[PDB]
Design a protein around this ligand. Structure first.
Ligand SMILES: *C(=O)CCCC[C@@H]1SC[C@@H]2NC(=O)N[C@@H]21
Lengths: 426, 527, 106
């Protein structure tokens, strides 16, 4: 960690838009386009971003950066269209060079494999991941299916399952996750380390609105909706419902209804996709519990700084707990930490847990200070370690009594004479 | 009567394909012996097994009614039944079995039976390779128990009648006797019910998959997955669809936009207690309105909870591959998550006329703006999946698929804690190899398995491995290398070998890029 | 062997097997090692037959396992004396009275 000259408490001056943009502008920032000086700040510390593997699989951006002086690995998504140039082999005179258009917000075989490489490399390097996820799904065309997109999509999952560092996924504003692109980065893969957050201008679902209305809200149902909305169509439909008006009048009314209902299709289609869009909001995701929270873009820098700081400190203390008793599981470890916090600070202060700043400071005080406060948490960890080794001793002798009298001597040597008196007494 | 049984059996079996196409499932034949009448009753469901029963009409009753009496051995359903029993009007299993067969796939609750019959074929097929004991009777070759979820989410071993599933997923623990393990080996079978809310993983289906996979890992035994699904379940909140009103910019001219969607108080008061919708009260156009900001939906299983669930099971599959055997059989289709679940097992059998896709052809045509694709088989059929290394083996139907699964299992340990199965082979170890690799190009299979003696009409030239034991996988992908399974003296082994002949790699053209071309590339051997 | 003492390396394990073969069969039969058939038969006899020959190799493996768990016990108490008197009681309960007499005596 560095003491950065870029404040953590600032806001982000660049806002991702609905139109295509360079993903670097939100990561690092851009020169202020209005003036000649003046840099618009991005998410990460100014000047800290370094991209790697830049020209390969240009639909995805990977690199290293610092957030408040904390190094992180970075994954982000290109939303502009890019051109892949493939050269011609001079050993095959019948070959040709090709240009292929690659859209943004799509996982192709190359970009999926690049993402796998980045994840695996950063897991080995020892850095947390900050993922800015904006994929609309995988390419399903013939040529990407032939070029093994499915395999690399599986590799992404296998990479994330082996993370040992914090993995924070954030859906930026005007970004969406659809279908296959969610299920491969879902926090359920590695629940101990992975977390997902969404902006208020985010979307997430299985299918985009168009794909949903094409299944559940076809024309027949659209007409049923129009039956109870459009005053003109209502008036005509009610008039035709009168018994025995006349043949000519009924014919005219039917033609008027046909023309009106057909004329109104595009507008109620837009309404239908709007309705389906209301099912893909982050409010629903928050209610169902698939994301942790809903964040604001401008203040995301501060939030993620304090959150990552908390998570790293928690990792330190959790590793100590695990080494004290390697037979504990994750729920047990987390419960121990929660209980110790309350027990030491008090029950009135128990609400100070979902506060990343406050709890990070408390953890730091327990981890960094020695010969002094003496770090009560260290004492509890030592208790765990002592009891664990004692259980191992008892387990080995009880499972194998035949050795009990071969070790009984050595452990009664480096003892006080009173302890020896107790041994003899028994 | 036994000779009549044999005659009818053969005649039905040879023409069984036509009877299947014409949906002829039942047949009865009346004939007199010598005279005593006999009545032959034939049931011909799924095209792997033909059931023949035989009954005599017996008049020894107290009334003027006549009833059937069988021959003791396999009395059957009509034993003691009146000869005038009318024909019924389909049952529990039918009208679901029929739908599944109408989609070109087998009904899920017919899978156990297939296994049994396939095992019979297995015991026959391997009789030319190894010295096997006498096979047990079919009734002792396979026993299974269905795995169901309780009210808490845990597994229950249950014995019940087929067709009683309330969810789209079914699983079994099967114990069966094979030639290599004639004392019983265990597997876990998991399958989709295509007829339950067409395909469609829900949360409960995901949970059952997860728990069964957990059982397999805990026991260290194989996991078999039968894919017939439509990806993640989706839906729409119909309770709102018929209530909402559009707040138009111009209520008389709707073509200058609308501002929002809203409920009236009469509707909002009937849903606010359900947490189905989130609205905020506004005053607009002199009306009290509840403007919709988020829709939740009162129905569970259609929302983002299916994303989590899908991801969850995906992770499970990734773990399972590294602890146990995972095999996947594709019988109807897999979309989205289903495909990944197949891929994460990395051992795929694909039935002819089935496909593994992520996006449907119709969706792609809608995105691209023209009718580019016609069939989903253009996107995920055999001609793609089997040539790019996703599918290991192709089969013609579901029954052959089941057989292939069992065949593969005959090479490997019964559990992760067991040794490799050894057989008492009928191919001697002490012989020599009669085929000799030459300096000129040759087929690697000739040295692996052997070849027909080219001089004569009979006479096989023996190779390195046991005769008949070699089974190649992924054959048309990357043809410069040969990989497969085999047995050496009854010891199963993996096999890697190299092609020395030149091969031609054919690369298709993408129909979505009219400027693309198909290509043939020569690939030399020993590279 | 590895489960008896997971702290052994590969050379140690292979050496143990070689030595045990020679010690049991004899030094004159020591050449019967680079003979896959003969040695495979010998190993099979040691692995498949129980309640009978009793598989001397299994006894040597059991010796390794016993000494390993003993070393673990000693290592834990010596690295952490503060627990020595918390386990001293339990391991002196399921013992013969003469063993208890030795505990009291010493
Ligand atoms: C863009 O909206 C989605 C692009 C999906 C992939 C497209 S479909 C047809 C082309 N073939 C291919 O492999 N990828 C392209």
């Amino acid at each position: 960690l560095l003491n950065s000259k870029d404040p953590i408490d600032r806001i982000i001056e660049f806002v991702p838009t609905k139109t295509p943009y360079d993903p670097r502008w939100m990561l690092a920032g851009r020169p202020h386009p209005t003036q000649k000086g003046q840099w618009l700040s991005g998410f990460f510390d100014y000047g800290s971003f370094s991209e790697i593997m830049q020209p390969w699989a240009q639909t995805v951006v990977v690199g290293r950066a610092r957030l408040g002086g904390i190094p992180v690995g970075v994954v982000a998504v290109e939303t502009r269209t890019v051109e892949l140039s493939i050269p011609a082999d001079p050993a095959n005179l019948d070959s040709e060079a090709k240009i292929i258009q690659q859209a943004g917000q799509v996982w192709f075989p190359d970009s999926a494999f690049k993402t796998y490489q980045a994840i695996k490399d950063f897991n080995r390097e020892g850095l947390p991941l900050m993922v800015f996820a904006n994929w609309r799904g995988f390419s399903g065309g013939m040529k990407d299916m032939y070029d093994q997109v499915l395999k690399f999509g599986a590799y992404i999952v296998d990479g994330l399952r082996e993370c040992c560092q914090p993995v924070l996924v954030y859906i930026p504003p005007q970004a969406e996750l659809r279908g296959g692109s969610w299920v491969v980065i879902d926090s359920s893969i590695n629940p101990r380390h992975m977390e997902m957050y969404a902006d208020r201008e985010s979307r997430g679902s299985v299918l985009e609105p168009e794909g949903t209305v094409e299944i559940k809200f076809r024309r027949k149902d659209l007409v049923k909706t129009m039956r109870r909305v459009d005053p003109v169509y209502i008036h005509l439909a009610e008039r035709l419902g009168t018994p025995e008006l006349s043949t000519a009048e009924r014919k005219e009314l039917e033609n008027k209804l046909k023309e009106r209902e057909e004329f109104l299709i595009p507008i109620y289609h837009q309404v239908a996709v709007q309705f389906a869009d209301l099912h893909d909001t982050p409010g629903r995701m928050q209610e169902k519990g698939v994301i942790s929270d809903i964040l604001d873009w401008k203040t995301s820098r501060t939030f993620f700084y304090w959150r990552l700081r908390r998570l790293l400190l928690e990792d330190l203390v959790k590793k100590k707990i695990h080494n004290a008793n390697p037979e504990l599981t994750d729920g047990q470890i987390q419960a121990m930490l929660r209980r110790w916090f309350v027990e030491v600070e008090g029950t009135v202060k128990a609400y100070v847990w979902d506060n990343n700043k406050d709890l990070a400071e408390w953890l730091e005080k327990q981890l960094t200070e020695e010969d002094g406060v003496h770090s009560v948490i260290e004492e509890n960890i030592k208790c765990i370690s002592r009891d664990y080794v004692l259980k191992q001793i008892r387990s080995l002798v009880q499972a194998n009594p035949e050795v009990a009298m071969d070790s009984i001597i050595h452990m009664t040597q480096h003892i006080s004479p009173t302890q020896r008196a107790e041994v003899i007494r028994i | 009567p036994s000779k009549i049984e044999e005659s009818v059996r053969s005649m039905v079996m040879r023409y069984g394909s036509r009877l299947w196409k014409l949906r002829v499932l039942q047949a009865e034949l009346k004939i007199n012996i010598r005279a005593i009448p006999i009545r032959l009753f034939l049931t011909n469901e799924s095209g792997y097994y033909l059931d023949i029963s035989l009954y005599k009409e017996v008049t020894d009753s107290r009334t003027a009614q006549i009833m059937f009496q069988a021959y003791g051995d396999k009395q059957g359903p009509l034993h003691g039944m009146l000869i005038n029993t009318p024909y019924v009007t389909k049952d529990l299993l039918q009208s679901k079995r029929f739908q599944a067969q109408s989609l070109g796939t087998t009904y899920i609750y017919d899978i156990p039976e297939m296994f049994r019959q396939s095992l019979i074929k297995l015991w026959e097929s391997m009789s030319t390779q190894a010295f096997l004991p006498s096979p047990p009777l079919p009734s002792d070759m396979l026993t299974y128990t269905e795995l169901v979820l309780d009210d808490q989410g845990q597994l229950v071993h249950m014995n019940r009648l087929p067709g009683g599933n309330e969810i789209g997923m079914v699983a079994w623990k099967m114990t069966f006797k094979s030639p290599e393990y004639p004392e019983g080996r265990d597997i876990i079978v998991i399958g989709n019910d295509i007829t339950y809310r067409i395909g469609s993983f829900g949360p409960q289906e995901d949970l059952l998959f997860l728990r069964a996979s957990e059982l397999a890992r805990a026991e260290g035994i194989p996991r078999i997955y039968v894919s017939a699904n439509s990806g993640a379940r989706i839906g729409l909140a119909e309770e709102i669809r018929h209530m909402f009103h559009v707040a138009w910019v111009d209520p008389e001219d709707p073509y200058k936009g609308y501002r929002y969607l809203y409920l009236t108080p009469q509707d909002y008061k009937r849903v606010s207690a359900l947490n189905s919708v989130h609205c905020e009260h506004v005053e607009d156009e002199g009306e009290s309105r509840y403007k919709i900001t988020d829709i939740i939906g009162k129905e569970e299983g259609i929302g983002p909870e299916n994303l989590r669930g899908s991801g969850m099971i995906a992770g499970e599959s990734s773990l399972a591959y590294n602890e146990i055997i995972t095999i996947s059989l594709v019988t109807c289709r897999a979309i989205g998550i289903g495909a990944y679940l197949v891929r994460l097992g990395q051992r795929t059998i694909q039935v002819e006329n089935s496909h593994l896709i992520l996006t449907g052809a119709g969706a792609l045509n809608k995105v691209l703006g023209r009718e580019v694709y016609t069939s989903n088989n253009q996107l995920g059929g055999i001609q793609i999946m089997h040539n790019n290394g996703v599918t290991h083996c192709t089969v013609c139907d579901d029954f052959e698929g089941v057989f292939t699964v069992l065949h593969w299992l005959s090479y490997m340990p019964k559990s992760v804690h067991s040794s490799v199965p050894l057989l008492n082979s009928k191919d001697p170890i002490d012989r020599i190899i009669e085929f000799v690799p030459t300096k000129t190009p040759y087929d690697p299979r000739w040295m692996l398995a052997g070849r027909p003696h080219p001089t004569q009409k009979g006479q096989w030239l023996s190779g390195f491995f046991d005769y008949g034991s070699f089974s190649e996988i992924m054959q048309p992908w990357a043809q410069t290398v040969v990989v497969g399974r085999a047995r050496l003296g009854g010891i199963p082994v993996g096999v890697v070998a190299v092609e020395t002949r030149t091969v031609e790699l054919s690369i298709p053209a993408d129909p979505a890029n009219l400027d693309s071309e198909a290509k043939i590339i020569q690939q030399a051997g020993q590279v």
